[PDB]
Each structure stands twice: as C-alpha cells, then as structure tokens.
Amino acid sequence: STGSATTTPIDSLDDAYITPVQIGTPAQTLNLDFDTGSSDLWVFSSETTASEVDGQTIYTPSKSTTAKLLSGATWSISYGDGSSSSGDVYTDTVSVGGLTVTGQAVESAKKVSSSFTEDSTIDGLLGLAFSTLNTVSPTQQKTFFDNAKASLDSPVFTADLGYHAPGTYNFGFIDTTAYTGSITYTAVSTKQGFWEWTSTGYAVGSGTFKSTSIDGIADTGTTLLYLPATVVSAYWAQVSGAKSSSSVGGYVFPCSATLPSFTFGVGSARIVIPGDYIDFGPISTGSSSCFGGIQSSAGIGINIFGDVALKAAFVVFNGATTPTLGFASK
C-alpha cells in the first residue's frame, strides 16, 4: 500500500504545516501537524476542557463505530517549546492520503496548553519519530508509520514541504519526479528516539564550505533551524544590523535586509536554503525588526533541522531495519 497527502502552511510565515487525517467511522477529518520529532498521535476531542478549545475541529469517539477506549491508558507530553497536552486513549481507524491503519492509538486530549488553544488551525499532532518516544502509559503505543510499515510497498515516508506553498507527505514510495538530481542517504542514530543524523558542514551565502560535523535531528514539527552558536554567529555576521536580542529571544535583523543563503552538507552533497526562507517577518506587527529563521541551539541541548532546512529539500525517512535519512534538492 501507499498513501499521499497534501500538507499546507498554517499561515503566511510557514510556522507549521497541517495535513488532513481521517479518524473513525464515519470519518472525522482533522488537520494534524505531522511531527517527525515526536511519537504521539493526539487530537483535540469532545473530552478536551471546553475553555481550552477555540476553533479547532474535535474528534468525538462516541460518534465513531470503530472507536474503542484503551482501558487504563493515559498520555502526557511536553514539547521543546514549552507546550504540553494530556489525556486518555482510544484505538480507531486512521487514514492518511488513502493509507489506512486499523487499531491506531488516538490520544484524546483532556487538557492542552495555551499555545495549542490559541492556534485554531492545528487540531492535533501526528508523531513520526520512533515509537520509543511515545508517552502512553502503562503500555507504550506505536506511531501511525510504525503500524503501517509492514503493509507499505517500501518502509519509508517522505516530506516535501513547500515554501509559502503546499507540499506533500508520501507513505510507502519515493516520487522520483519530486526532486532534482539524486538522493543522498546518511546514517541515523535512533538512540534518543529521533531521526538523528550528522551534517558534514555548512556555508554562508557564497562563502567557502566549512567541513565540520553537526549532529542534529530532522524535525518537521519545529519551525526554525537551530544550530551551534558558532555557526549561527557566522551566518548573522553577514547581515548588516543583525544582532542577538535577549529580550526578543534570538537573532533579529532589519526587515530591509536581503538575507544570504545557508548551505548544509549531507555527505558530499549540499542543500541550499535560500535567504528568503530565513525571514520570519516582523517581531510584532508593524515593527521593522524581523525575526531570524536560523537560531542558536545552545539552550536546547540538541541541534534541530526544522522546517527552514527541511523545506529546502525532498527528505526521505527510511524506516528499514537500519533506518537512514535521504536528502535531495528540488
């Protein structure tokens, strides 16, 4: 089997992407944030505290003839941005782009933190990291991809995120028309539960490539590119007037600037992020100070190849017995 679904930016900045997902019988379609940095499929629901729902579409398990309470199971998750959610668990039929999994754990939120409530466009998350990170207790549950894998034509999914435009998540096949050149594959460590890999270096604009190992994670659920402070300083030093602002929370730059590109290495291959992809717009409405899309990871503990980086590539998440990642230009 295969599946193919369009993923759409939630706003004009590409802050996140939503993909329609069919849950239950008859189908209830929710728009979920596919997140290769986490491993829970959780949804706003008829069980979510009413004051914490503000425009999201909810899953109502009592209206699904295939829903079953997973007795005794609870979940609770906290994300790198400080947001969180928790609740109980049903199993139900879940379909993405024509690919159907029966008995998928659907984690129904009883509580969500304010940032989720405040974002009416995201109805939940669909985790695509390794199932070892799934938070369901006392019996950890598998991700949608883990449950689908054996049925897929090939045990892979691909992320093709758009810049200011829709893109595609495919399951079970590699669309050879969706990228240019060849796909360069690179090793993955699953020791932390992430799609963790090592970039071979970077360049700023037209500058020389610096060969240096940068361990980080491929994370579709993180907006920005978070890299070591040395790398980030070298980038922003090429933007007149850019500075790190402790009050704003990162590097800012004059909105009148033209940003240089940023290149990262994948083996001997190179992925070029155009400068425009690094512009996240005014820090507040009407400001001429703009927020940068490349930020320091120094306070995180891990480097993160988020959407800024991934949307410059066609990315293969290869879930074979020894997982690997592939990157192609597009």
Q: Position 126: which residue type?
A: L
- What is the residue range of 207's domain? 175-330
DSSP 191-225: TTSS-EEEEEEEEETTSPPEEEEEEEEE-TT--SE
Query: 3-state DSSP helix/strand/coil percent for the chain, to nearest 5?
Result: 10, 45, 45
Is residue 163 located within the same domain as residue 185? no
Question: Determination technique for this PDB entry?
Answer: X-ray
| Residues 10 and 152 occupy one common structural domain | yes
Query: Which of 117, 147, 174 is at the close of a domain?
Result: 174
Q: Clarify whether residues 67 and 146 are in a common domain.
A: yes
Residue 222 contacts residue 241 (beta carbons within 8 Å)? no
- Report the CATH number that the domain containing residue 268 is assigned in CATH: 2.40.70.10
Contact 280, 290 (CB under 8 A): yes
Are 109 and 208 in the same domain?
no
Q: State how beta strands 41-43 and 294-296 pair.
A: unpaired
Looking at the fold, whether 152 and 186 belong to one and the same domain comes out as no
Catalytic residues: 35, 199
Domain boundary at 123, 145, 174, which?
174
Cα distances (Å, whole numbers) of residue 126 to 8, 105, 145, 148: 15, 11, 10, 13
Point out the domain boundary residue: 129, 159, 174. Answer: 174
Give the C-alpha separation, 189 to 222, whole Å: 19
**What single-letter DSSP state applies at residue 261?**
P
CB atoms within 10 A of CB 113: 16
User: Are residues 163 and 204 both part of a single domain?
Assistant: no
Residues 301 and 192 in one domain: yes
- Mark whether 214 and 129 lie in a shared domain: no
For residue 83, give the DSSP letter.
-
Q: What are the backbone angles phi and psi of residue 272, rounded to the nearest 5°?
A: -105, 120
| Distances, alpha carbon 46 to alpha carbons 40, 58, 110, in Å | 18, 6, 9
Burial status of residue 60 (CB atoms within 10 A of its CB: 0-12, 13-18, 19 or more): middle
Same domain, 75 and 149: yes
Taking CA atoms, 134 is separated from 13, 25, 96, 218, 228, in Å, by 29, 25, 19, 17, 28
Asked whether the beta carbons of 16 and 9 are under 8 A apart, the reply is yes
| 51 and 188 part of one domain | no
Residue 259 sits in the same domain as residue 322: yes
| Number of domains the chain contains | 2
Do both 156 and 261 map to the same domain?
no
Instruction: Tell me the HSE value of 67 on the side-chain side, using a 13 A CA sphere.
Output: 21
Tokens in use for 20?
Answer: 């329609």
